[PDB]
Symmetry: C2
Amino acid sequence: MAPLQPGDSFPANVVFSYIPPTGSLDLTVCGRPIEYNASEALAKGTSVLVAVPGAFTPTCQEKHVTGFIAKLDQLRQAGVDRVLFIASNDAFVMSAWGKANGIKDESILFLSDSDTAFSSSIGWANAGRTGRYAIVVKDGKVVYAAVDTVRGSTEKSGVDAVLTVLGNQ
Amino acid sequence: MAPLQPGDSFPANVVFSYIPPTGSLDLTVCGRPIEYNASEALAKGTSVLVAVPGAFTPTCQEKHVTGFIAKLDQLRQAGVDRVLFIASNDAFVMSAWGKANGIKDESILFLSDSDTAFSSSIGWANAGRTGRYAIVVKDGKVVYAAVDTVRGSTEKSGVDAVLTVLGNQ
């Protein structure tokens, strides 16, 4: 366990599991998971990595991913090259959740932190679920890492917080 | 652990977690899980309880629940009062999976075997997932319980096997 802080290098050897998007929103289209090498992807450019406690939790409590989708253009303008949403759900569930939210491309990738391996390694996981947190990386270096512990809050991990981070650098 | 066999009473104190269906197929409608008392529900009438290793696994490998949906009328004619599909996925994921399969009522309920508590107690669970199996109950007594171990097979737990069981009694 090592709490990630600004200035830290993004940990090496971080891998997620995901079903690559196809352009389709049909939840019955066949898919097969592959490994996503997150440490390699984050070594260049600006990345936003967001964890949620669970796929398919209701909007009545959760408007986390919807907020990012609504402001994807602002994120593109702020220089974001990739947005990654992770949870402990497997790749099949994460793929369906991405499609349920209308994402058919790479604007946001939906991936599995298998067995909360990554989230646990940075201290933000419990009882088989990741925490709710956001990490901003530039060229392999952490610029921002914060976790929401208040239930139903996205103050630290929401899109508005991430956009504020970017608007400063 | 106690392998269920024909003639056994259905175990007592079996509970699942599910989001009651609303009539809507919208995957963004808000929901809140409740306990489903399966031992009580199965004490009267004819019930079919089917477990799958995971919600949202692709059709290319899996046509298990689709087979039951296609033959719901035959099941009703055979005297089935309730069909229950369970997996280790949480109630939110199971609810979305039911809606993704077009079910908006109680023809098939989609529920969570939390922590594979039930499936483990009868010996058909491993590494956090239930097995693929089907149990037929009449008035609290097991009439049929069989598990598919061949990957991608529904020979024992598919709808055709269940319909054969019913056509004999």
